[PDB]
Design a binder for this molecule. Structure first.
Ligand code: ATP
Ligand code: ADP
Ligand code: ADP
Ligand code: MG
Ligand code: MG
Ligand code: MG
Lengths: 456, 512, 177, 457
């Protein structure tokens, strides 16, 4: 039956129902006049539910009549979502008519079971040298791109979309969670101009929205990817800022009556992260390859939101403000980026030995920073001087010009295969290019382009 | 003039208008007032105990943790979202119990003991209590039997015995799970059964750990207990006690067991969530005040008990045998901050710890053990005789070598005792490196400690030490098989074994 | 919290019992006698004594009130006193009266005027207010020398200002601006 | 008359009584039918008391009848407690039957008066070199052994129990407060094998017990030591973790309705510390020599709990994380540890100039360490080179093999006299061993053993 609004504090609305007609947890509700959707979070007792609005609450008053829909928030799924832009409720926002779907799915469901999990270590080549070297990816795996403000996260994801699109022929789901509306318009017009829009489904809940939309939009994009996975396909899922789901759970947490945890976060932080992240996996029916950008607040990696995010991922790419302040892009810290595919029974002994030697030379270069800053390079020993020289050539050769960064520089982008990366870093570590200057190793694709840049 | 308590709701008050007597509802029955975030607040249940199971409709069970004046706060052992206000709740009269037995070996279960591997039902003949009190001081026997992890640095410098608690602490992705899983894998011919408890992990990591146990032939000796990241925080809080009860079945019948808790920090996060949602008052980093007690009631259950306790427990069926339970908790720190609350509590509970550091992990020392900060409280009591005799004083000499190697970085000329100390420390540092999934027996490690500590490595330069070690072990496996088997019977050492290893290394350095 | 927030489920439980058992005027007289007894200074001094139990405070209130309470009203007094909510007893009664005014479809309207209004004038304002509010209205007339003419109607939060003091304030705001 | 349980939240239990029969503060209460005792902490009004259980709360329900005993928690005292292991309530937790005591005492008591105080200055030799050099103990004095997790507080306490309490003609009380059950069993079999157990009373409350046990077990051990002191005897008292008394007082504190103070502690921290520490002292009737090891959280001496324990002690021994991490044990920091008996009128002039010379040379080398770490050894002057070499030999000679640590070193332990220590440190300070290498002074004992070890390098 119908209830009445008794309390409005921000995004959180308390609705009183009759006692034989109290709606369940995660049930959608509709205000009778304005058609605002509410989603039930808590049952407080006394007939009263506490809910979060999926929209603006200005103009709402106490005493408004609220209907219950009997089910959760259900979004369209299937073939009809491709090429289309939708919001959190599944309504189209691209001015292109209704979605002609054949079925709708609720956005809340459980994780797949332990017996339905799928193992696999088949390598996915990205064309980027530092990513293929020190933290390699797998098909059906999970990628985090950690980093602070303005260090590159979106540029790297756009390059990873462009290079992972080469050898992939299935579908893709892109979810914008709490990021820039201008970035959504640019990516849609780029895919529409180059005719790849009909393989990709777009869901957007951006920084301009009330926090219920930002709290629930990644569930909608994951529900569409779960329908594509349960049809037996291989699908790509891209999520720009998963940190922005979490921060939306900050913004409603004290309004839901919760005591705060450490540094003001919600006390249910790891459970909301686990209930979202355990649905992203590949199963035995089909596979999901996922790339997620992860924001780091105030450049602090020991902040609890990235520190809970770290164990949910197969591959972790950590970006650094210091490496980008040296001018090196894509700005990956090679001593902080790990993956479980860096293992000699997956990639072979040669690639693993080259990656361990690169990490050894960069770690011993990192240990000499204060003594190089105070007394200089001249009072090192001779093998230390040779290792600092090879370390600066390794640090310059880890940078790469990108195809999506052609607007920033004018230099053309490069695709480097894995074999050329292993051979070039092996040739730097063995001493084959000790006669080259270090600025010839900067912003080239192969080691042969460093050989041609040295004669200039 | 305080706020409204959860029994101040008008059906309850109108009930008291219709009949003032408390016997309108039975003392073993109640009704759901409120459902929020896995917390169910219940009016009634006047005969409930702390930790008692509560039956909800639909097969859902819960546990009462807050017993207030007017209301009962309960946490749901499963999904909570199907529960509703006005449902009837029942006292079962029972505390939470799990299946125990040797039938759980080879199986992957959840925190309640239901199987999740799809391999059928578990035919356990016995159940036992999840929350239990550790045995008293008169019923214990001192730790004096070895547990071999297969690693040179652990079995030579920080040894673990049967009934000891040894922490594995360190930063993210530097090999904590690798050490614990390889210590489980090395028990496949030892007689010690194993329990691995995964708290807060993702499910694919759990299935990768179970396939890495199955590829190395160790899955049939191991119970796996899983409480993954999308499960309820109550099951994540109760999973180490349930796996501890499953390990303690073997301890109470005069047999030996080993258990890994792969994240006790995530169990502290789950108990912090349950304590904040029950509105218990917080302290440092919003953790509850009883959180040290949360670990200390767990890790004190790992113990070695005497023969008289085993004869009292089995009623004379098992005589003359001790039982033990060895614990390996694992604690994640945040960028080397050991001053946080939960790592301070767990270092203060255990019988020593193994510290793993990110810098030596990046510098190629792959087991990554900081010998200056790591320690064993049982010591040479937890070792065999040949390993105790050959490893005496290695750890403190390596700590003195890390002091001396940073003292003499820019020294022009040093004396002979200093040059000898630095050269010996460089060879022992290179000898302690070891690959993942390659265990070493007692005989191979004693060949390596004889070669480092008797000065057979002083002509071997540093990039050849690992090759010298593998070639010397391959030479004793072709030419002295009865000697390596005789060392591998018990770990014995006398003059004849000493002369045989000395003649074998002298002939290896003569001819190879 | 506010007094109405705490007093809401007691008045709702008493209204649901008195609507279910057809005892609306009995509980309205009982809660009026209980509110007026609990606001007297000697009873208020007795109800704040620290050595008395809650059962003795409920027994003293029941023995004072006597024949104005039936047995479920006495059960209601013991339930109020066991939860330590006796100071809420005026507010509970007020909220009960509001619930009964929504059940019988009536509204209590205060009308203030500059001069005395006759029965024809009150019946005329009551009929206009009954047409607007779709309820049976009950007017309560009062005098004020601050108004120079007209009436002021107050019905809950609804204020209709027909006085010339408000038109003088509108003319002052219109010519000041 | 009896009360009834109205609330159980964790270890804290609220009981309602009738208004003429409210139990007093620190009255013991017995729950009917379950073997659990409650101690009254607060009177909340309206007949309700708030209490802490002295056992597990798994078998407790609301509605259980609770009787009052009319007194505090009383434990057995006298010489019947010798050779026995008791818990916080005084029940035997060995299997040797009942304690046949003739007197029981309540565990809560006043401190002795200002006129009752008596302080001597008699020296107590320990046989540990750094403790005999820089922190000399006093008979009937109070000793702290500060230190973090794993730096050696228990091994140092076992070496002091070996070198003092075995040859002691009087009685001893050991109080295990919130520590490991394995160490408690290990110590009981060590005193049983050495035929020493008949002079020592053991009181144990381990870290897995409820917070009420860990909150009062030190009061139980101190009550038996107070009976032995007020009989006129000279008593030893060893507490392995006095910090666990504080930390359990953390665990109940905000559930008792207290707002928290700084670094998450109870606001009554210094007063609860002073109530326990002011009863340990020696009086004019008898003497108590007490050795307490104090846990330091995360090696921070400016944490409020060790910083409140620093004023209560006569002799403070501070163990460093850095020195134990260099492989040097006993690991006493010789610049951070002082004693009230480090006076020229107590130990003599010669002992005082040797100890201040050692501390001056080590404080100088503490300022020269990073300079040698950046530029090297050759860039100093000649007196700096001689002082750095003499200081490294002083830092190796402070180390000692122990008899109780032979399971950790592999080498046998040494007992070194005071005069051997003063003569050896004076011989290193005067430059009489400037020709020996620094490795000759590591883990040897007397200065003659350093000379014998230098011929084997
Ligand atoms: N001895 C070793 N030799 C080589 N590689 C090793 C060794 N030990 C561990 N590794 C590698 O180190 C990586 C990290 O190890 P591991 O996953 O066990 O770390 P962890 O600290 O438990 O991580 P998490 O944060 O997932 O709990 C793995 O890829 C593993 O293969
Ligand atoms: N590969 C790159 N080459 C050149 N400039 C780059 C590159 N990556 C990032 N930048 C610079 O950094 C800015 C921020 O990048 P962006 O991906 O938007 O960061 P984030 O997502 O971390 O906020 C870019 O607009 C550009 O100026
Ligand atoms: N004197 C010593 N000689 C050798 N090893 C020691 C010594 N003191 C401590 N250790 C080592 O350090 C460990 C920790 O010492 P312990 O006394 O248990 O520390 P604490 O009581 O301060 O926590 C010992 O178990 C042993 O391995
Ligand atoms: Mg961005
Ligand atoms: Mg792990
Ligand atoms: Mg200790």
């Amino acid at each position: 039956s119908s209830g009445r609004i008794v309390q409005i504090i921000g995004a959180v609305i308390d609705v009183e129902f009759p006692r034989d007609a109290v709606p369940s947890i995660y049930e959608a509700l509709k205000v009778q006049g304005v058609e605002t959707t509410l989603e039930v979070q808590q049952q407080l007792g006394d007939g009263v539910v506490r809910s979060i609005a999926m929209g603006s609450t200005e103009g709402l008053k106490r005493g408004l009549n609220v209907d219950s829909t009997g089910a959760a928030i259900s979004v369209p799924v299937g073939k009809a979502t491709l090429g289309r832009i939708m919001d959190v409720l599944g309504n189209p926002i691209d001015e292109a008519g209704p979605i002609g779907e054949e079925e709708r799915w609720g956005i809340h469901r459980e994780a797949p079971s332990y017996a339905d999990q799928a193992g696999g270590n088949e390598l996915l080549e990205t064309g980027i040298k530092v990513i293929d070297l020190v933290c390699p990816f797998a098909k059906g795996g999970k990628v985090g791109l950690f980093g602070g403000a303005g260090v590159g996260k979106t540029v790297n994801m756009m390059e990873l979309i462009r290079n992972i699109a080469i050898e992939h022929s299935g579908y893709s789901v892109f979810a914008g969670v709490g990021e820039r509306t201008r970035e959504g318009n640019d990516f849609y017009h780029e895919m529409k101009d180059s005719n790849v829009l009909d393989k990709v489904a777009l869901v957007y809940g951006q920084m301009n929205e009330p926090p219920g939309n930002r709290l629930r939009v990644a569930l909608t994009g994951l529900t569409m990817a779960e329908k594509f996975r349960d049809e037996g396909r291989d699908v790509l899922l891209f999520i720009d800022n998963i940190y922005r789901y979490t921060l939306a759970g900050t913004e409603v947490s004290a309004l839901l009556g919760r005591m705060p945890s450490a540094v003001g976060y919600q006390p249910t932080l790891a459970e909301e992260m686990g209930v979202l992240q355990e649905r992203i996996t590949s199963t035995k029916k089909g596979s999901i390859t996922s790339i997620q950008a992860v924001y780091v607040p105030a450049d602090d990696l020991t902040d609890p939101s990235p520190a809970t995010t770290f164990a949910h991922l197969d591959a972790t790419v950590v970006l650094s403000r210091d490496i980008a302040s040296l001018g090196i892009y894509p700005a990956v810290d090679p001593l902080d980026s790990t993956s479980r595919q860096l293992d000699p029974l997956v990639i072979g002994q040669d690639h693993y030995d080259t990656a361990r030697g690169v990490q050894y030379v960069l770690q011993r270069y990192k240990e000499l920073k204060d003594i190089i800053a105070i007394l200089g390079m001249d009072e090192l020993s001779e093998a230390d001087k040779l290792l600092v020289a090879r370390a600066r050539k390794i640090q310059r050769f880890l940078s790469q010009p990108f195809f999506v960064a052609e607007v920033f520089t004018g230099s053309p982008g490069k695709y480097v295969s894995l074999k050329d990366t292993i051979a070039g870093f092996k040739g730097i570590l063995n001493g084959d290019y000790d006669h080259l200057p270090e600025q010839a190793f900067y912003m080239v694709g192969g080691i042969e382009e460093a050989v041609e840049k040295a004669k200039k | 003039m305080q706020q409204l308590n959860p029994s101040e709701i008008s059906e309850i008050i109108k009930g008291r208008i219709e009949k003032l007597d408390v016997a309108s509802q039975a003392r073993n029955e109640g009704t759901i007032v409120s459902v929020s975030d896995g917390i169910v607040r219940i009016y009634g249940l006047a005969d409930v105990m702390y930790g008692e199971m509560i039956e909800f409709p639909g097969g859902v069970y819960g546990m009462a943790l807050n017993l207030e004046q007017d209301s009962v706060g309960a946490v749901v052992l499963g999904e909570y979202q199907g529960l509703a206000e006005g449902m009837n709740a029942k006292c079962t009269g029972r505390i939470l119990e799990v299946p125990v037995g040797p039938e759980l070996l080879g199986r992957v279960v959840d925190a309640l003991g239901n199987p999740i591997d799809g391999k059928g039902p578990i035919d356990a003949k016995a159940t036992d209590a999840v929350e239990k009190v550790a045995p008293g001081v008169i019923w214990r026997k001192s730790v004096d039997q070895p547990v071999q992890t297969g690693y040179k640095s652990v079995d030579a410098m920080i040894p673990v015995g049967r009934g000891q608690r040894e922490l594995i602490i360190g930063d993210r992705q530097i090999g904590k799970t690798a050490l614990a899983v390889d210590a489980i894998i090395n028990q496949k011919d030892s007689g010690i059964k194993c329990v691995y408890v995964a708290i807060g992990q993702k499910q694919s990591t759990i299935a990768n750990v179970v396939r890495k146990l199955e590829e190395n032939g160790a899955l049939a000796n191991t119970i796996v207990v899983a409480a993954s990241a999308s499960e309820s925080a109550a099951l994540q809080y109760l999973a180490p006690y349930s796996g501890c009860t499953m390990g303690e079945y073997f301890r109470d019948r005069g047999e030996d067991a080993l258990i890994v808790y792969d994240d006790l920090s995530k169990q502290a996060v789950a108990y912090r969530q349950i304590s904040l949602l029950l509105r218990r008052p917080p302290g440092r980093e919003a953790y509850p005040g009883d959180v040290f007690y949360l670990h200390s009631r767990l890790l004190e259950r790992a113990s070695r008990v005497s023969e008289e306790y085993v004869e009292k427990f089995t009623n004379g069926a098992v005589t003359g045998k001790t039982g033990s339970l060895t614990a390996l908790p694992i604690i994640e720190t945040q960028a080397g901050d050991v001053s946080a609350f939960v790592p301070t509590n767990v270092i203060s509970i255990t019988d020593g710890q193994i510290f793993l550091e990110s810098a030596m992990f990046n510098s190629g020392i792959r087991p990554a053990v900081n010998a200056g900060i790591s320690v064993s409280r049982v010591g040479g009591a937890a070792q065999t005789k040949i390993i105790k005799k050959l490893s005496g004083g290695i750890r403190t000499a390596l700590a003195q070598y890390r002091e001396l190697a940073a003292f003499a970085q820019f020294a022009s000329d040093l004396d002979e005792a200093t040059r000898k100390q630095l050269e010996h420390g460089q060879r022992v540092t290179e000898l302690m490196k070891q690959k993942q999934y390659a265990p070493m027996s007692i005989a191979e490690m004693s060949l390596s400690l004889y070669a480092a500590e008797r000065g057979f490595l002083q002509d071997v330069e540093i990039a050849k030490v690992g090759s010298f070690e593998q070639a010397l072990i391959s030479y004793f496996q072709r030419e002295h098989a009865a000697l390596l088997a005789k060392i591998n019977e018990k770990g014995d050492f006398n003059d004849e074994i000493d002369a045989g290893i000395k003649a074998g290394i002298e002939k290896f350095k003569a001819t190879q | 919290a506010e007094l109405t927030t705490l007093a809401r489920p007691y008045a709702k439980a008493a209204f649901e019992y008195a609507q279910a058992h057809q005892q609306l005027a009995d509980w309205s007289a009982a809660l009026g006698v209980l509110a007026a007894v609990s606001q007297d200074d000697t009873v208020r001094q007795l109800l704040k004594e620290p050595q008395l139990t809650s059962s003795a405070k409920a027994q003293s209130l029941i023995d004072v009130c006597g024949d104005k309470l039936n047995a479920p009203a006495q059960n209601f007094v013991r339930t109020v006193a066991e939860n330590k909510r006796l100071e809420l007893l005026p507010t509970i009664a007020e909220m009960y009266e509001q619930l009964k005014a929504e059940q019988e479809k009536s509204v209590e309207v205060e009308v203030t005027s500059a001069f005395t209004l006759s029965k024809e004038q009150q019946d005329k304002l009551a009929k206009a207010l009954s047409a607007r509010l779709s309820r049976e209205v009950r007017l309560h007339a009062s005098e004020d020398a601050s108004l120079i003419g007209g009436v002021i109607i107050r019905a809950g939060d609804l204020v209709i200002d027909g006085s010339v003091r408000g038109k003088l304030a509108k003319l002052a705001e219109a010519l000041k601006s």
